[PDB]
Design a protein around this ligand. Structure first.
Ligand SMILES: CC(=O)NC[C@H]1CN(c2ccc(N3CCSCC3)c(F)c2)C(=O)O1
Lengths: 193, 191
């Protein structure tokens, strides 16, 4: 239980400058102070260590958003979307290596692909519901179907925050991505040509 | 573009419609093109190199199409015809598009190829935004390059999700209207 934390902390540290494939099971066992076979009391494989790390990061975001879902709407409509987008920016930005490794594994692991697909569907669904609620109150024009607008905005964030977190080029500079995304959500959700 | 080289590339693109590159053998490619296996290795060293040539061909088709409309309306239409170049070019080659995106995690050439063209299309977008600012048609909100980067990355992710049939995704029939709406509102809107 205490050695299990050691294995996860070692994996997250090692993933910062090495992909999971360049990480052996012996690597994690040494990092945790245990023999290699003793690892398998805690985890069936290194893939399961990544899955546990990703599940905790994803659920950290999920609980931070749901905390905002249960509490009154902010007088300031720009700031309500900024606070939601910032959960993603801060949660995943605090676990870049796991975020990166998680994205790579979406191609190879049905568990990872399902975790990420399901999380994105959940928060796209929530975004569509807030937009539709904004229309019902007259705060937002009835332009595009809410769920399609919400999907594209959420897909932009996934791609743009990942590009920023991985240091890719092209990419928005890290200190600027929050303002950039918020501007595009707010104008596309509240404007009409 | 040798006559047998085109048969290899056409066979590859056909087979990629329903099978990933990993389920396609060199023997699959040779037989489809009506050639021997050594003939195959006369033109390509690997099936990955076939994919790279295929993707290089569609990427550059989109680019050329984009430059000729740059070489030449209504505001919404400008951005729509521009976005449509990518929706139509990559939409006419969904198999190569799907395989191209998968190979970006394994092939540095594929990665660098895509990255180089995205930077070019992003810089182009920023300059057009800048010129709509210069003539007073667009407000000076975010820096043009940052706005251009998030919008182009949106299109990349959203266009791939449709062509790859993912969930979540925007239905193919609605992706152009969706993206056009977000561009024109975010480029021309303030507050
Ligand atoms: C499938 C894929 O990945 N596409 C990549 C990007 C490129 N791009 C893009 C670039 C330049 C413009 N121009 C066209 C003339 S007018 C001013 C804007 C444009 F509309 C769109 C996208 O939206 O997707």
């Amino acid at each position: 239980d205490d050695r299990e934390l050691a294995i996860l902390a070692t994996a997250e540290n090692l993933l910062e400058d090495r992909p999971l494939a360049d990480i052996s099971v012996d690597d994690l066992a040494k990092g945790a102070g245990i023999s290699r076979p003793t690892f398998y009391f805690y985890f069936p494989s290194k893939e399961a260590v990544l899955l546990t790390l990703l599940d905790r990061v994803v659920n950290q975001a999920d609980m931070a958003l749901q905390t905002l879902a249960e509490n009154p709407a902010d007088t300031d409509r720009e700031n309500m979307w900024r606070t939601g987008i910032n959960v993603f920016f801060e949660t995943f930005g605090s676990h870049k290596a796991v975020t990166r490794a998680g994205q790579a594994a979406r191609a190879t692991s049905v568990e990872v692909a399902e975790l990420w697909s399901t999380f994105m569907q959940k928060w796209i669904a929530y975004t569509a519901a807030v937009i539709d609620a904004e229309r019902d109150r007259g705060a937002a024009p009835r332009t595009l179907p809410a769920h399609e607008l919400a999907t594209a905005l959420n897909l932009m964030n996934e791609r743009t925050l990942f590009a920023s977190f991985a240091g890719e080029q092209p990419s928005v500079p890290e200190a600027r991505v929050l303002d950039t995304l918020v501007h595009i959500w707010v104008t596309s959700i509240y404007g009409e040509n």
